[PDB]
Amino acid sequence: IKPADTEPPPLLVYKWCQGINNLQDVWETSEGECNVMLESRFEKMYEK
Amino acid sequence: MCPKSEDVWLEAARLQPGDTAKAVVAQAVRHLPQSVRIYIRAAELETDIRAKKRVLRKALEHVPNSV
Amino acid sequence: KPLPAPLDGQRKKRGGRRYRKMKERLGLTEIRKQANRMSFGEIEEDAYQE
Amino acid sequence: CWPRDARMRLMKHDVNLGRAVFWDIKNRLPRSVTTVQWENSFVSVYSKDNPNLLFNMCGFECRILPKCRTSYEEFTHKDGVWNLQNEVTKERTAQCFLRVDDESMQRFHNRVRQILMASGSTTFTKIVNKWNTALIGLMTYFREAVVNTQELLDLLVKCENKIQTRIKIGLNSKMPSRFPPVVFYTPKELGGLGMLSMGHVLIPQSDLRWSKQTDVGITHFRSQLIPNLYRYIQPWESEFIDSQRVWAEYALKRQEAIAQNRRLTLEDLEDSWDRGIPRINTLFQKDRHTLAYDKGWRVRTDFKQYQVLKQNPFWWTHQRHDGKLWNLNN
Amino acid sequence: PTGEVLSLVGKLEGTRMGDKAQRTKPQMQEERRAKRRKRDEDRHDINKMKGYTLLSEGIDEM
Amino acid sequence: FSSKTEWRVRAISAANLHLRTNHIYVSSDDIKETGYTYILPKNVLKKFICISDLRAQIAGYLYGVSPPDNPQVKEIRCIVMVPQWGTHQTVHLPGQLPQHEYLKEMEPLGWIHTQPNESPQLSPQDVTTHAKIMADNPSWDGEKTIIITCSFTPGSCTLTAYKLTPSGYEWGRQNTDKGNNPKGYLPSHYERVQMLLSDRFLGFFMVPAQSSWNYNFMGVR
Amino acid sequence: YDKKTGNFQVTELGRIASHYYITNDTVQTYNQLLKPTLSEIELFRVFSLSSEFKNITVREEEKLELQKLLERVPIPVKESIEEPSAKINVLLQAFIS
């Protein structure tokens, strides 16, 4: 759950890129592996 | 800021909790021997008869001519 | 109610007494020095904090 | 905003996988609690067909491109590119290319339009102060991603020329030829507007002459391009590695000062001073103990936009808790 | 040479982004150092007799 | 040096050098992609950071091999500490290269040394040291031998491996100016090479047999 | 020691404190303070924080002499000489020297 008090949103972006990059064989696609980044907004969150 | 003043030291004994007020009173009797109000305040602070006896024994050794 | 007709004051021609209290309400004895000034040469704060 | 080879390539398996992932996430949320709409979402598949993994987070537009996967190239240091290396083996395994979101460049553009539209009857100093505030908020939030986004650099000099053009037509309605930058960029103490510049402003050698008379006579003198703001803001990657290593140094200095029973003074931690993402400055504040009970303050500063009509450019930070994350004294 | 702000696109090649970013020093290091020094030589009597209580110590009166 | 209590605060500071060993940074820029790759194992790097000094530079000769069926990567398997003394800007290693029967199975991959603080360039003293070692020892191939610099950044260590270009070996061989800015010293004299870390294998150390490695106090010896 | 059944189980710190007579506060000090990463500098400090020396105070009448030891003892002392642990540190090192 973000924004954390200890990281600004660009530190959130850096920690997220380095956290993607540090997953185990995350860029290996030889066996058919596929990463999927979903980004979304929980539409009408505050209203509903 | 005001050493050699018995009433500030008695206020300092009265406003602390008693176990650090004991160290306050020890500061006061380093600053002010021959001072009977600090020693009676030291006596009232300790809640056992043996320690009150020892403290007032030191008090009478310091200033012995106080009724 | 309409806007009042923008006449200026006749003016304060008498002073002291009530009028010093009239300004002591809102336009009182300010700093009048180093609060209304900008100090041409120096930068006293961090530069673009504003 | 990315090139066509740098976007997600819409191969059939990857498009079906992105839609399938989205459908799986969308079924878990009941439509009455919250919806997750495809049209406002973005699902980037990285696979054997798509070599780039893309996401817009926090106004940043990030494209991670692995070294194993369509680099084939020696790289020098580029600014918006984040060399992502592995934590255990320290090998650069991917590059995160940063950009600014088009909504964020549009927010900056609409902010400059709000400055200019409500300029009107205000002081030139207030228009340039609003420009400085919007420019510091943009430039200190988006630090490397501005230098990588050429559309934002074009937009930045367009908005800078728009602010300067409103100042110039507040001076004289006839638009000048060769207006001097010295009236904009001189600091407010020295009389000018104090405008921060994010664009190439070359000062002519004509604009640097000055005479001075005493009783031997008139002695003529001379002295260049105006400094840009990006050179005076530390990159975010530099900020995070120096924050990591400087709060590591604070941890060792703090345990050796607890060993020496004293407090950490200003003489140690003077090399660490404008450094750290919580700044080391924040250790030496009077209110610091009070700020140890201000939890959730960043979500609070984000939600200030629904309570305060004044738009906050530092919505993401606070001066109290993070310190001043920039320094424009030099 | 106009006074127009030109784009930095294409004009970043000799520069890095941290190039010319500076850090300030702590304001009034030596005044706070002198305050802390005077405080630590004034607190010598209190911190000298901090653990010494009038009741339970042997070298109180001496 | 101050030599009375400078070593006391330095000794105390060096007693906390194990805190630098979980904050290790590797400079992954300017790497030409066409050379060797170097896997320094984290156990000899941790031990090399702990036995060092924050001010005086220590140095160890790297020895290593290549993994099976990967000749373009060089697993450093050994750091040989030799009798050295070092100033804050150079290391005075002896003329004799490390000879032992355990280093016959491995090839000399250059040397590692600590720096007091991070420089973005290789030192001119380091390229003169590397090129004098190369000019006096034909087992030091200029393609494969490197200089890892473990610079002591705040609370951490930044590691950068450099290789000598054939311009740099010729200049450092002919060089005699031991200053910090000698004549004819260009940044084309070195190229940053890829160096990376490892939990997957362990290196070892070679100390001198009769004496120990640190001659910074025994400087006349 | 569980307060449920009242049973005691011996710890290896218990065996070491019983075998070498060091008090229970001293093994709690050596349990808090002994790390694998201790230098020879920190080892004299962990020794000097023993509860056997809880009554060792540094008196001012010897502080000058202690300074003449602290400039001559070969293992550095992180403490200041008017703290008692520095006194126990330099007294052990002045013994060995």
Q: Pairing-aware structural class of the strands and helices of chain C? A: mainly alpha
- Please provide the ordered H/E string of secondary-structure elements of chain A: HE
Shape estimate of chain A: flat
Give the C-alpha Rg of chain C: 19 Å
Largest sheet of chain C: none
Distance between the termini of chain C: 40 Å
What is the CA-based Rg of chain A, rounded? 15 Å
Q: Name the chain pair with the biggest interface and residue counts per chain.
A: A-D, 37 and 64 residues
In total, how many beta strands of chain C?
A: 0
Please trace the helix and strand order of chain C, writing H or E for each element.
H
Main sheet overview of chain A: none
Question: How many DSSP-defined strands of chain A?
Answer: 1
> What proportion of the residues of chain C form beta strands (DSSP E)?
under 5%
Query: How many DSSP H or I helices of chain A?
Result: 1
Q: Based on CA inertia axes, which overall geometry of chain C fits?
A: elongated
The DSSP helix count of chain C reads: 1
Strand proportion of chain A, as a percent range, falls in 5-15%
Report what the structure shows.
Chain B: It comes from Homo sapiens. Chain B: This is Pre-mRNA-processing factor 6. Chain B: HAT repeats lie at residues 47-67. Chain B: It is found in: Nucleus, Nucleoplasm; Nucleus speckle. Chain E: Residues 15-45 are annotated as: Disordered. Chain A has one helix at residues 9-21, and one strand at 35-39. By secondary structure, chain A is an alpha+beta fold. Chain A is flat. The two termini of chain A are 20 Å apart. Chain B has four helices and no strands. The longest helix of chain B is centred in the middle third of the chain and has 14 residues, at 18-31. Chain C has 50 residues and is mainly α. In chain C, 18% of the residues lie in helices and 0% in strands. Chain C is built from one helix and no strands. Helix content of chain E is 31%, strand content 0%. The longest helix of chain E has 14 residues, at 29-42. With 62 residues, chain E is mostly helical. The N and C termini of chain E lie far apart (87 Å). Chains in contact: A-D, B-E, C-D, D-E, D-F, D-G, F-G.
SSE blueprint:
This is part of a larger assembly, with three copies of chain A, one copy of chain B (67 residues), one copy of chain C (50 residues) and two copies of chain E.
Chain A: H1 9-21, E1 35-39
Chain C: H1 18-26
Chain E: H1 29-42, H2 44-48
HAT repeats (chain B): 47-67
Subcellular location (chain B): Nucleus, Nucleoplasm; Nucleus speckle
Protein name (chain B): Pre-mRNA-processing factor 6
